[PDB]
Structure 1
């Protein structure tokens, strides 16, 4: 059931329950959260308005956690200037449960 859902500024399709990783959220460790945001479905849930009206995808916040430490580093030539800076983004482990439109 290809149901889209925008969360964390970005939106993605959602299968009938599956492991997914999304932007950080203010949910309990292993609780449940509903994303009223939903677009389309398995049988052509045309999204009239920007977002489908009565409908919702729910998922269990499997857990939080930071990720790979990407390394940003600036440098300008002929001019003593260099900046080493590490940065690792946070992300919640949204395990999809219910996909009821």
Structure 2
């Protein structure tokens, strides 16, 4: 049993009991998110449509992340041009409890 969900221009395959980092959304930690958006069943035939209606999955925001820092560097030879910018990209963790059809 599994689903295929949609959050933040992306699609992930979720089990019940799956801790998963997702693009950051707004729920204060411990708040609960049904994401009325779902794309696939794992007992099959239900696929369909963009999105099977009536089904969603529930996950509880564990808290809001800031990822490890990417160093994004830009250099241009012979023109005396260099730039340095630090980047941490905010996320939210989710635990997937149960998937309702």
Report the TM-score when normalising by structure 1.
Answer: 0.94
Deviation at 1:24?
Answer: 0.4
More strand by share: 2
Structure 1 Cα separation of the partners of residues 43 and 27 of structure 2: 31
Q: Secondary structure at the match of 1:9?
A: coil
Report the TM-score when normalising by structure 2.
Answer: 0.94
Q: CA 1:22 to 1:45, structure 2 compared with 1: closer, same or farther past 3 Å?
A: farther
User: Runs ≥4 in structure 1, deviation > 2 angstroms?
Assistant: none
Residues 39 and 45 in structure 1, CA contact (< 8 A), matched pair in contact too? no
Q: How much is the aligned-residue C-alpha RMSD, in angstroms?
A: 1.0
Unpaired stretches in structure 1, ≥5 consecutive residues = none
Residues 27 and 61 in structure 1, CA contact (< 8 A), matched pair in contact too? yes
Q: Deviations over 1:56-91 (max 9, x none)?
A: 001000111201100001000010000011001011
Number of aligned residue pairs? 101
